[PDB]
């Protein structure tokens, strides 16, 4: 549902010449208590990685 | 170079801190301190 909360994390920082950071989204909690582990890549608005 | 030699041999002298007596400090308690074996409470009778 909309308003479900997704929790992620990043690490390692950027190298030189890099302008995007890898984010992994880990879990999502539905407003009604449903919980699913989706260890999926986080992308930009058009699907570009990180 | 003699000057570079002297610098190389005396450049790493760690600093010294001086704190005067009577100054205020804190102690941030790092663990739970349990005082249950050395004190007990009792009510003082009225008058």
């Amino acid at each position: 549902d909309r308003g479900s909360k997704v929790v992620g994390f990043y690490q390692g920082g950027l190298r030189q010449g890099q302008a995007r950071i890898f984010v992994q989204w880990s879990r999502i909690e539905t407003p009604s208590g449903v919980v699913i582990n989706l260890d999926s890549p986080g992308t930009g608005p058009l699907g570009e990685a990180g | 170079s003699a000057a570079a030699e002297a610098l190389r041999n005396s450049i790493n002298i760690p600093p010294t801190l001086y704190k005067n007596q009577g100054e205020r400090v804190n102690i941030l308690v790092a663990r739970d301190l349990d005082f249950s074996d050395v004190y007990s409470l009792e009510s003082i009778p009225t008058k």
């Binding site: 994390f9 690490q11 | 663990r31 739970d32 349990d34 005082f35 249950s36 074996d37």
Partner: peptide
């Protein structure tokens, strides 16, 4: 005479708890 998953390697290493054991007064 005598007888005889484990990943998140850096963030999860930074989140390891520090558990200091309490003290009892004497």
């Amino acid at each position: 005479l005598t007888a005889g998953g484990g990943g998140g390697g850096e963030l999860a290493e930074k989140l390891q708890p520090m558990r200091l054991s309490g003290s009892s007064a004497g």
